[PDB]
């Protein structure tokens, strides 16, 4: 569960992302494909080459879903239900992969926000991404 400071911490860190969300989302993705090659099994229909616009296009989507969850930090289950339905019933992504992407996102953020990526902030972002992943896998069965 996200505490007042967790929320404050994610509103702030994500606030700084501001503009680069999509750009960062795409990087997170690239980081995941490379470090956790098994993740590529869900994107067989994609161009997974450095700078593919498929990846850029998808990174943006991911980043906006995150931006939306942040904006509805207080109602995440409802904010992302369509996305849960989707992952639960169409994509059917093994829950394990949420943890891998979330890690890549943390890496990505750490890499771009040296100043804001504090132990406290790191901690809050980690719980944040975990609840997002939780929300997204809640309807799997």
């Amino acid at each position: 569960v996200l505490s007042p400071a967790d929320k404050t911490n994610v509103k702030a860190a994500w606030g700084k992302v501001g503009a680069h969300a999509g750009e960062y989302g795409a990087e997170a993705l690239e980081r995941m494909f490379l470090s956790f090659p098994t993740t590529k099994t869900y994107f067989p229909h994609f161009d997974l080459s450095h700078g593919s616009a498929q990846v850029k296009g998808h990174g943006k989507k991911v980043a906006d879903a995150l931006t939306n969850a942040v904006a509805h930090v207080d109602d995440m289950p409802n904010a992302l239900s369509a996305l849960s339905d989707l992952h639960a019933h169409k994509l059917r992504v093994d829950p394990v992969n949420f943890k891998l992407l979330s890690h890549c996102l943390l890496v990505t953020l750490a890499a771009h926000l040296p100043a804001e990526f504090t132990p406290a902030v790191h901690a809050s972002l980690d719980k944040f991404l975990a609840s997002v992943s939780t929300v997204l896998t809640s309807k799997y069965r």
């Binding site: 099994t41 093994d94 992969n97 069965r141």
Partner: protein, 146 residues
């Protein structure tokens, strides 16, 4: 895989009483039923909307016997599950786009099917050797992913 000879001796001996047909049919069926997202690879198998739809589906079954059949053979190569499954590794990666995690899931359903079927005979120690087996298989199958 590092198996003791008492470990291997015990694996071997129970494996000897497996009806691969129905045990593979049972294992794969349960997978589809317990972890429904694993069904994403089998839309072409037909109706999987119910545990019976799944359990009694002939594709599941035959696919089960096929999978379990290949399991059986690695048992003959407990010392080289790696090279035993190299081609199947590339195929599952390169062609079927199977998340290797599914392999872990299967191994655990298997272990559960064996227990169910052997009851009392599938002892803490027999389970422990088997756990080593299905983990080695999952890893051997996950081997050529890139």
């Amino acid at each position: 895989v590092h198996l003791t000879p008492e470990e291997k001796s015990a694996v071997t001996a129970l494996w000897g009483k497996v009806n691969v047909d129905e045990v593979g049919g049972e294992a794969l069926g349960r997978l589809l039923v317990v972890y429904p997202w694993t069904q994403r690879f089998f839309e072409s198998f037909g109706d999987l909307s119910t545990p019976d739809a799944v359990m009694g589906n002939p594709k599941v079954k035959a696919h089960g016997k096929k999978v379990l059949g290949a399991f059986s053979d690695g048992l003959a190569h407990l010392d080289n599950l790696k090279g035993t499954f190299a081609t199947l590794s590339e195929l599952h990666c390169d062609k079927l786009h199977v998340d290797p995690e599914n392999f872990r899931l299967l191994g655990n359903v298997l272990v559960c099917v064996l227990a169910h079927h052997f009851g009392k005979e599938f002892t803490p120690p027999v389970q422990a050797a088997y756990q080593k087996v299905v983990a080695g298989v999952a890893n051997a199958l996950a081997h050529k992913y890139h």
